Structure formats: C-alpha cells, structure tokens
DNA sequence: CGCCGTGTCCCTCTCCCTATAGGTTAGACTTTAAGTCAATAC
DNA sequence: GTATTGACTTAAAGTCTAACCTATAGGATACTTACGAGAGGGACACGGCG
C-alpha cells in the first residue's frame, strides 16, 4: 500500500532489501523461507541404507 | 534493451517535488508553493550573493 | 425467454452519465423509501454488487 | 483478437561450438570516450561509426577520410543578403551610427 | 539589418583586418547588440499574434500550446525573411509563415505512425472531400466515386483510407468498458508454443536417425546439400571441393539417396512431421 | 513586544497548391549454378 | 547394377536505366487572451501567556 512514497523514500535512503520475508520471495519466483523451503529440509541428502 | 534520451536542459523528477512530504523542499528549505513557483518557471532566484 | 425481453424494458437503472455509480452508490440510496409502494418493485433487484 | 510485435522466431538450436570469426575495432568520439563493436572479419570497417553514446566517433587507427561537412543551409545575412544590397546596408549603416551620434556628443 | 550588416562587418574586418578605432569599434558594438535587441522586441510584439492564429487549429491531433510554439517558430523565419521597402503591414505577410508553419507540424508530428507530408496532404483532401460530399450530396461517398473526384483510381483510394487509420491504445475498452486493459485479452503469434519446440527436437533426433541408417558419406552428402550441420547448404562446385570430386556423381547421389527415402520404412516414422 | 496550541480547510489515498532535388525500386540483359541425356566400362 | 565424361538445355541471379516516392522550401491587404465516506497529513489563521 502507497507504493510511490514508500518506493521514493526507500530510494532516497537506498534501502537494500535481504529477500528473507514470505512476500520477496514470491515476488522474485525463489523459493519462500517457510515450509519446505528453509535450509533444514531444503538440503537433505538422500542416499539409500 | 533500454533507450536514453538527452535533454537539452535540465528537468526536475516529480517524485521528489511534488509528492508530500516534498523532498526538494525539505533538502534545500523551500516551501512547495514557492518551489512550484521556481521549477515552473514562475519566479527567480538566486544561487550565488557574494 | 419473452419475460426477460419485456423486463430489461421497463427496467429503472440509477447508475450511467448522470447518474451516481457504483462506488459512489452510498448504502441509503440502495434501500427501499416508503414511496416506492406502487411506483417501483421492492422485490426484483440484480443480486449482485 | 490475435497479435504480432512484426517479428518472427526462428526455433534454431545454439551452435556456440563454431561460429564465424569475429574481429574486434576500436571507435573513439571526440570527448574521450572509447568503445569496441565486435564487426564480421570478412566485413569493411567503417571509420566513421554511431556509437553507443550517440555521436559520431572515429576509428582509433589513423585514416581522417574528412567528408566535406555541408555550409549551414541558409542564415538570416544570407535571407538578407538575397532581398537587399550590399550598399543599401551600407546605407543603413552610416545612417545608424550617425544616428547613435547626433544621439551621443550632440 | 543594419545589425546584421555590422556584424558582417566586424567578421569581415575581424579576420586579416584592422586595428579599429576605439570609438567607431564601441559604437559598433551597440549597433550589434541593438540588432538583436530590436529583432527580440518584434518576436514579442507578435507572439500575441502566433496566438490568434494558432487557436483555430486546436481540439484535433496536437495540444494546444505545441501549436503556439510552431508559430513562434514561424515568427522566427517571418521576421527573418520580413522586407519592409514593399510597405506592408507585419501580420500581413508574417501570417502565411505561421499557418505554414503550423500545418507542417501538424503534418508530420501528430501521428504515433509518421505518414509523410505528401500523404497528409492527399489524406485531408479526401477527407475534406468526402466531408463535404457527405453534407451537400447526402448520400454517403462510395470509394469509385470518391475516386472520380479525386482523380485517382480507385485502389490508390482504398490504399489511402487504409493509411489513415490510426492506432487505439492497448489500456482500453476491454470489449466495451475500460474494466481490463485491451493488452491482456491479445494473443502472441510470435511466441513459443511449446509444442513446436518439442516436436522439433524430436524431428531432428529422428531425421538423424533415418540418416544415420543410410549409407556412408552419400547421406552425409545429403545432410551437407541440405545443411543439416553447417548452416548454410553449399553447391555442388563446394562438395566436390570438400571431398574432391564432380558434381554429376553428387546429383546422381542425390537422387539414389533421395529415391530410398520415399520407400516406406523411412517416410512412416517421418511422414507424420510434414 | 515576543513566541506557541487549537481550529479550519485543502489535498491525498483507500474501498491549400507549386517547384527542386535526391533516394528507392521494378524491370530487363547476360552470366552461372543446375537439371538432363547419351554412350561406356567394369 | 554401379562407377564416369561430354555436351545440351534451363531456371535463377549483378548491374544500368527509369519513375515514383521523400526531404525540403515557399507561397504578401490586414487580422494579436479557448472553451459516497473515512482517515491522515500539511498549511494558514487566530488567540493565549511570559
């Protein structure tokens, strides 16, 4: 919401973003850091016994 | 692929003078009826007194 | 059918040029005034927005 | 409702194992800056270029081929010059500072 | 233009020339300087005048104050171009600078696909044309008659009144009202359909296979005469070059490799790509 | 005489014609890569 | 059937010439100003206290 303000001040402060949040993450098409998409179960090696 | 132009003269954006609270106004302590009376071409003013 | 041919006739729309639209229709236009007894149906109204 | 940008994809598979041989040139405009076009080897290489800036720059090897820049295409002497007279002016001219004369020391 | 004959003159004398005297050098000067000052003082007499002009030709094609700064410009040339020994009043002859003006900025910077002055020009007589048939004849102007009015065939006509359309914005109507941009309702002919692209692999990989089961280096020859690996297919002279025979043998190659994969067993599991 | 709160209001966001000069293309001529046949040898 | 050469004809193209577009200029009597609410924030006025 108020996109403009947000966008020229965040411009103004050059603001950088970290891309961690659930929104961010949608938005650039990587996979969101909740659920199935944090590191703990991102990374499981998977070998037979 | 982006494009640019050259402007012959210089032009101000509106993001920053237009939109309240107008940054313009604030970085250099101008009211925006008057600085709307500058960048218009409206009224003079002076950058230099020695 | 026949009956919605006659009744898109007949039909008093207070919405177009002139007349208030939907998002500045407020809810006390929309309700029925104790005039429309015989002047205009309280029943037969589009059901959606 | 169909619609075309006036283009067309070619389904071609990339083919970065050969191509043809590509030289590269160096172009210079007049204020310093520098840049370099990948032009074709069996191609001529145009001393004269349209930058990425947007002047017209020079090849940094030496050739200066100077093709004749065209006169400006008409001034307001020229506009005069064509309507009038060279001793008509004169005229006017003498008339002129006499003018600011009488008008000066009286 | 005694300042601009001035100015010629101390460009004159300025090259090669003369030491001037201090007072004839400074007076000048002013003269120069005047010249300049008196040509502003008319331009802004004869705005006002550009403006008058200029209001007419409003509420089509430009805005409005563009109009006024292509008469400002005609102004330039009319007070560059103004005699006064013919004794005329200004506005009389400045006047036809500004309407050429005008309409010359109208012509060719009021449409998002440039059409040329000549085909502005042949465009609004047609229109004034059949403008003007349509209310003094009433019936509305067939295209052959419109023609035989305007002197032209009548296929220069229909190329004309397919000229003269100009583009709608894609930030519309979505059928009727401006709920959707009319840009999300457009298809993309240019575009991969995702069937095409898979399809086509799957032709090459078998096409490779037919050729591979044929015979060795006449297929190949195939393969190079219709450029199935360098790109670009090469004659018979450059065939011959590369393997250092004629090029009767390669036509007679061609044709007995080409006969093969008529017969079924190649064509079946390629005949369904065509 | 010199500065500070409260109030009101404005604004923004959300749900003609002519004349000259020069570039473009279309159209035909001669050359070349291309398709063709006839005899032949292994 | 598969390896050739020597004519023998044929469709597809670089270059010169002509017309048809294209950029450009010019064209004198005198004319001189169009045609809903709902909330938050900022700026301008007015009055109160030391």
Redesign the interface.
Request: hydrophobic share 45%; proline share 0%.
């Given at each position: 919401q108020e996109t403009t303000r947000v966008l020229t001040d965040a411009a103004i402060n050059c603001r950088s973003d970290k891309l961690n949040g659930l929104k961010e993450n949608v938005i650039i098409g990587k996979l969101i850091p909740a659920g199935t998409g944090i590191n703990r179960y991102r990374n499981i090696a998977v070998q037979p016994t | 692929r982006m494009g640019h132009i050259e402007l012959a003269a210089p032009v101000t954006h509106i993001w920053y003078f237009k939109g309240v609270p107008s940054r313009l106004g604030y970085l250099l302590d101008l009211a925006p009826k008057d600085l709307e009376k500058i960048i218009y071409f409206a009224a003079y003013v002076i950058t230099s007194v020695d | 059918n026949p009956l919605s041919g006659l009744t898109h006739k007949r039909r008093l729309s207070a919405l177009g040029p002139g007349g208030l639209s939907r998002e500045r229709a407020g809810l006390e236009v929309r309700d029925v005034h104790p005039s429309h007894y015989g002047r205009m149906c309280p029943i037969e109204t589009p059901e959606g927005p | 409702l169909r619609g075309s940008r006036l283009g067309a994809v070619s389904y071609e598979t990339d083919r970065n194992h050969d191509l043809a041989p590509r030289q590269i040139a160096r172009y210079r405009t007049d204020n310093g800056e520098e840049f370099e076009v990948p032009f074709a080897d069996d191609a001529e290489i145009p001393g004269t270029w349209l930058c990425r800036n947007g002047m017209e720059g020079t090849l940094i090897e030496g050739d200066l081929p100077e093709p004749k820049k065209v006169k400006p295409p008409r001034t307001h002497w020229d506009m005069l010059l064509e309507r009038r007279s060279i001793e008509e002016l004169e005229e006017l001219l003498k008339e002129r500072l006499e003018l600011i004369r009488s008008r000066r020391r009286g | 233009?005694?300042?601009?004959?001035?100015?010629?003159?101390m460009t004159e004398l300025s090259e090669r020339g003369e030491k001037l005297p201090a007072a004839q050098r400074r007076?000048?000067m002013?003269?120069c300087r005047d010249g300049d000052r008196a040509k502003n003082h008319l331009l802004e007499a004869n705005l006002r005048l550009v403006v008058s002009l200029a209001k007419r030709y409003t509420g089509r094609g430009m805005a409005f104050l563009d109009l006024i700064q292509e008469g400002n410009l005609g102004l330039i040339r009319a007070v560059?171009?103004f005699?006064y020994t013919k004794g005329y009043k200004f506005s009389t002859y400045a006047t036809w600078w500004i309407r050429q003006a005008i309409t010359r900025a109208m012509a060719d910077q009021a449409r998002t696909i440039r059409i040329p002055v000549h085909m502005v020009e042949v465009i609004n007589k047609l229109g004034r044309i059949q403008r003007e048939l349509l209310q003094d004849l009433g019936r509305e102007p067939t295209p052959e008659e419109l023609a035989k009015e305007m002197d032209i065939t009548p296929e220069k006509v229909l190329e004309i009144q397919q000229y003269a359309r100009e583009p709608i914005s894609l930030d519309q109507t979505i059928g009727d009202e401006g709920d959707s941009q009319?840009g999300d309702?457009?298809?993309?002919?240019?575009?991969?359909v995702a069937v095409?692209?898979v399809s086509?692999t799957l032709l090459?990989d078998q096409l490779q296979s037919v050729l591979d089961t044929l015979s060795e280096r006449e297929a190949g020859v195939v393969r190079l005469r219709f450029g199935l690996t360098d790109?670009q297919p090469r004659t018979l002279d450059e065939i011959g070059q590369v393997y250092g025979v004629t090029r009767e043998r390669i036509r007679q190659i061609e044709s007995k490799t080409m006969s093969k994969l008529r017969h079924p067993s190649r064509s079946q599991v390629l005949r369904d790509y065509l």
């Open positions: - | - | - | - | 233009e005694a300042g601009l004959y001035a100015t010629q003159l007076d000048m002013w003269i560059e171009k005699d009319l309702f457009i298809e993309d002919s240019e575009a991969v095409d692209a086509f090459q790109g």
